[PDB]
Amino acid sequence: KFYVREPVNAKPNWLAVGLSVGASVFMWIYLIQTHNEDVLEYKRRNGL
Amino acid sequence: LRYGLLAAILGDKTTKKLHEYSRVITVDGNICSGKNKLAKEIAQQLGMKHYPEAGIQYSSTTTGDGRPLDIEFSGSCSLEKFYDDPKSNDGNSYRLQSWLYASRLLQYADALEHLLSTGQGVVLERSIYSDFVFLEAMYNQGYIRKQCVDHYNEIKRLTLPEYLPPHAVIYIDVPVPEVQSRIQKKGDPHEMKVTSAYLQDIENAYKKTFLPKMSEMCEVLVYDSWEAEDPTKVVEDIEYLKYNKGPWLKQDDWTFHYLRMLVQDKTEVLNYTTIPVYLPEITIGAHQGSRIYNSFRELPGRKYAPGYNAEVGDKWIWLK
Amino acid sequence: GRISAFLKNAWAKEPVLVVSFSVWGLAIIMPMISPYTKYASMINKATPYNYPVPVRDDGNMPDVPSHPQDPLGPSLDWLKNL
Amino acid sequence: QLLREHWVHILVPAGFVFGCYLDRKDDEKLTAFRNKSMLFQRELRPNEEVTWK
Amino acid sequence: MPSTFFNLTMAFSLSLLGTLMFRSHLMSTLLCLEGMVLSLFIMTSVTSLNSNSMSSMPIPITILVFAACEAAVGLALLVKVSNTYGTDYVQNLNLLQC
Amino acid sequence: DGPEKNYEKTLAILQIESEKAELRLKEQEVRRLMRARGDGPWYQFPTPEKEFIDHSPKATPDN
Amino acid sequence: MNPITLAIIYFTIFLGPVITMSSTNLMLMWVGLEFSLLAIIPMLINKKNPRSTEAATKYFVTQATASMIILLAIVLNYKQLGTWMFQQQTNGLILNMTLMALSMKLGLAPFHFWLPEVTQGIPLHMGLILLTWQKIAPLSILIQIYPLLNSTIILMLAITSIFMGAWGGLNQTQMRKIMAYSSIAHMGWMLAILPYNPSLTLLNLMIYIILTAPMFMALMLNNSMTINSISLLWNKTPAMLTMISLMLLSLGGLPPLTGFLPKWIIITELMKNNCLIMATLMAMMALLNLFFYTRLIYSTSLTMFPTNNNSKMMTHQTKTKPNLMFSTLAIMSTMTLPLAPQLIT
Numbered sequence A: 001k002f003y004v005r006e007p008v009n010a011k012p013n014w015l016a017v018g019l020s021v022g023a024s025v026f027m028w029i030y031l032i033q034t035h036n037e038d039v040l041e042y043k044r045r046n047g048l
Numbered sequence B: 001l002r003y004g005l006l007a008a009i010l011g012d013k014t015t016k017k018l019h020e021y022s023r024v025i026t027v028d029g030n031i032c033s034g035k036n037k038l039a040k041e042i043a044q045q046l047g048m049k050h051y052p053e054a055g056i057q058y059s060s061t062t063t064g065d066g067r068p069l070d071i072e073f074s075g076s077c078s079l080e081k082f083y084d085d086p087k088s089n090d091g092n093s094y095r096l097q098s099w100l101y102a103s104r105l106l107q108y109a110d111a112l113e114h115l116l117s118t119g120q121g122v123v124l125e126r127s128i129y130s131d132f133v134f135l136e137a138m139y140n141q142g143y144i145r146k147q148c149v150d151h152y153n154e155i156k157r158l159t160l161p162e163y164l165p166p167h168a169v170i171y172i173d174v175p176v177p178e179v180q181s182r183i184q185k186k187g188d189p190h191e192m193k194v195t196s197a198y199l200q201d202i203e204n205a206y207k208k209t210f211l212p213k214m215s216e217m218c219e220v221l222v223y224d225s226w227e228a229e230d231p232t233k234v235v236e237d238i239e240y241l242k243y244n245k246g247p248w249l250k251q252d253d254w255t256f257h258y259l260r261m262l263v264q265d266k267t268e269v270l271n272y273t274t275i276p277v278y279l280p281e282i283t284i285g286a287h288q289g290s291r292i293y294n295s296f297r298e299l300p301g302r303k304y305a306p307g308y309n310a311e312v313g314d315k316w317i318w319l320k
Numbered sequence C: 001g002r003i004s005a006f007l008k009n010a011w012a013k014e015p016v017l018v019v020s021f022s023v024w025g026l027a028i029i030m031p032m033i034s035p036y037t038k039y040a041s042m043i044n045k046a047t048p049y050n051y052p053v054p055v056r057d058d059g060n061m062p063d064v065p066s067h068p069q070d071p072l073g074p075s076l077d078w079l080k081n082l
Numbered sequence D: 001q002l003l004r005e006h007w008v009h010i011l012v013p014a015g016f017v018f019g020c021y022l023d024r025k026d027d028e029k030l031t032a033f034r035n036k037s038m039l040f041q042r043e044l045r046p047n048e049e050v051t052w053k
Numbered sequence E: 001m002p003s004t005f006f007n008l009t010m011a012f013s014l015s016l017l018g019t020l021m022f023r024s025h026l027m028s029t030l031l032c033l034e035g036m037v038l039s040l041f042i043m044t045s046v047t048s049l050n051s052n053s054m055s056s057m058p059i060p061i062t063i064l065v066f067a068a069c070e071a072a073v074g075l076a077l078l079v080k081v082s083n084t085y086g087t088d089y090v091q092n093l094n095l096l097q098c
Numbered sequence F: 001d002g003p004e005k006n007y008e009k010t011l012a013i014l015q016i017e018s019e020k021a022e023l024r025l026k027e028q029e030v031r032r033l034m035r036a037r038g039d040g041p042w043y044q045f046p047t048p049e050k051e052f053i054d055h056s057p058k059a060t061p062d063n
Numbered sequence G: 001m002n003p004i005t006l007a008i009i010y011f012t013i014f015l016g017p018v019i020t021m022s023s024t025n026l027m028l029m030w031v032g033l034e035f036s037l038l039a040i041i042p043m044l045i046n047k048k049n050p051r052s053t054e055a056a057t058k059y060f061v062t063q064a065t066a067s068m069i070i071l072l073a074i075v076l077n078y079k080q081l082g083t084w085m086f087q088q089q090t091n092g093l094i095l096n097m098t099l100m101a102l103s104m105k106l107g108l109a110p111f112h113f114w115l116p117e118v119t120q121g122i123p124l125h126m127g128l129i130l131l132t133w134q135k136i137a138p139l140s141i142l143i144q145i146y147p148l149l150n151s152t153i154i155l156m157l158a159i160t161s162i163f164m165g166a167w168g169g170l171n172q173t174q175m176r177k178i179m180a181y182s183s184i185a186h187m188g189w190m191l192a193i194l195p196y197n198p199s200l201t202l203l204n205l206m207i208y209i210i211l212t213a214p215m216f217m218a219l220m221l222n223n224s225m226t227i228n229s230i231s232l233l234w235n236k237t238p239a240m241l242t243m244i245s246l247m248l249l250s251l252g253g254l255p256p257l258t259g260f261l262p263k264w265i266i267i268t269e270l271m272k273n274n275c276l277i278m279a280t281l282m283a284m285m286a287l288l289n290l291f292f293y294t295r296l297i298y299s300t301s302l303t304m305f306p307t308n309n310n311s312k313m314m315t316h317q318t319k320t321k322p323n324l325m326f327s328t329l330a331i332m333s334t335m336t337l338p339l340a341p342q343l344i345t
């Protein structure tokens, strides 16, 4: 116990950490799926 | 959860958490006349938070580790040096006055935040409303100059009307020879080097100027030492004291909320104390400011925001 | 219990706001309850403020009547029996 | 612990390798006239498929 | 109708020129503003009635309501000026120059 | 690598830049012509919609 | 203000320009303009001081006169064409009065005399609200009628807007007045590019908004009203001077900052439409704008002005004030120039 007042960021905001990590993971997975779907759609449309 | 508009919506109403003893009480008096003991006893037997006199190291004690910092970080002004030589050419007197007013403003903001957050009353010793007494005493003694007086008055006009006046002002009237005798009996060798002209200037500033401006807007409780030196009649008067004047009656929940935000953000509190008015008494050059600010930054626990300093044991820095 | 007591002593001390709020609620709910609500729109539709322009028929439509005194068409017997 | 202490010494060589890689990518991108310049229009050797990579 | 519409447009122009040439009375300035508002109402109403535009006769009602709320706001501002300065003189409103 | 690689890379770069030059000149001409006489996709300024016109028979026969 | 009227006032402030942009009717764009004006007036008179009352009164009378001129133009168009939209053959007098009144609403010169004074005397967040949000709706009305406007009148209004804005921002010291004449110069640039390419007008508007937001956030961090007040920022918040310098150089239009891109593409399109003299004069006045920006940079970042004694206590205290989207807007307003083909359309 160093600071005389309890810091706001003394403990990590676990809800914020979980929401941010899950959001980043979700956008990464959705990005990979949409990129693969766009590649497949482009190849199907152009006959490649 | 940090206090804010969302907390006010979900319910953090100051008027809901108020009670009878939720009062701002300020004890005032001359240099050495029973001011500390009476405030402590009043707060103890009224269940109120006692705030002693905000010294030079008030910000040092209330921020960080709470140990007193070096003098060059805490104002670079010495009360002992002022007592030894009040007319020094380096402007120690006005630097001490401005630093003590800033400390008193921070203490008043802390007390107001505590009262608005917990509902507990506060008993301050010599708040911001009775520091112009010391200002005018040094001006009438020739210790400071008219430019310093104008700058202090400008800062007081900038910061003072944003807060609420105390509910009660208990004053200790005391003769200058009695103050001199008590100062001699205390034994501080720097403190015996004070002049009866300065003490009379303090007492005259009190009687002529401080008591009336408290008088038309809050409850004034002048007592002698013998009316004092027994903290039961004063508390009885506080009990049988009616608050039917001042701006405290006109305050409602949202005014309390905005005042709570103002006193909970310390940067807005000390915003106008650092106005760019370049008096040579308080102006600090770029090189000295650079060195002082840098050394305060490698002071332990002050390099980063609180909770992010790994040298003092803060954990989960990478995760937050 | 407490809610019933609150409306009860509200009605005791001041009935103006109670009557106004009850009239407000009744004005909301009664068009959703009464069976005559559609009949106002039917009457407003049936009221002939404009000339009914005759149509040139090719004989492929038998629902339109050739004569006003015909059984065919939107009669207002419901309006007469209303 | 040597890799932990001297990890700063690989950033500039990594940038050099990355710059060589990007030069190679630009070089294979600008192949619209490979073995098509009239100064260097020659028949391909049987042991090779491109004049330059 | 063209002569009366020309008269209405000249009335609007005169009210606009009066608004642009200030006198000591912000009340008089607001009155010139409603001279413009009233001229706008008559031109809109006469145009709608001449064109038989029953779909657009609500437009005068909307301009009246919106301009009336705007003038209520302006009257509140003039009340604030009269309270802080004693009077509504526009030359008292000049300390934002520097 | 050799001089032929740089030679043919320069040829490809010059071809790309010349094609970009003629494409930019043509799009200047296209935009100028279309703005002067809007008849293609670009510079199609709006026009009130015919779908909001009443076509039902009305009270006045002379419409 | 209690949260009920705070929500109502902010919702109407939001709703005004939204109705103006979403609306295909001249009447509805008008009513959105006075939703914006009426809803924002209590926010100017929120502080309840004589300067705020002065700013609110001047702002009200200016917007009321301009709104009445707009309604005059709408009514005259309604008589002449029988519709509620300047379609193709409305009168040039009507269109010029519309442009006149929208320029009066925007505060560009020679109708610029109220904007520095209205920006002064109000809090910094209301200066940000004004100088960013209150201009999208008049720009929306201007963009909807781009092929009908008068290029001569627009070019005169634009070049004098940049002239007066550059000279004012050169003149004063106050941060709010500096930002107001900066706004006048930038609206001059947007107005000049309006008749030829409204897409570049929108691009310049977004670049100016994402440059104006972190200026105003940085000012609100310490309520620095003055050049001296932002000059002692090194003692208060030293971790911002680099971004202050970068964003002020971006506001000046210096490459490789992304604020060079609006001026560059505007000059390019103007030269596509052959107004070389106008483009040269605009760029020289932009150099004047960059001059007062560079003086501000010299005051706040590259030199170190003398400080006070209570700044030690202010450094003793902590702060959680600066919000998360300050850095995002700062980075997007500094280092976006290689994405110029993506930014333009």
Ligand SMILES: Nc1nc2c(ncn2[C@H]2C[C@H](O)[C@@H](COP(=O)(O)OP(=O)(O)OP(=O)(O)O)O2)c(=O)[nH]1
Residues within 6 Å of the ligand: B029, B030, B031, B032, B033, B034, B035, B036, B037, B053, B079, B082, B096, B097, B100, B131, B134, B191
């Ligand atoms: N110059 C100056 N001196 C001050 C100021 N505030 C307090 N002091 C001095 C007066 C005393 O010598 C010393 C301690 O303050 P006190 O008034 O509390 O004195 P002390 O604790 O000795 O007596 P007490 O029983 O509390 O009244 O600080 C101020 O604003 N200016």
Ligand SMILES: [Mg+2]
Residues within 6 Å of the ligand: B035, B036, B053
């Ligand atoms: Mg004491």
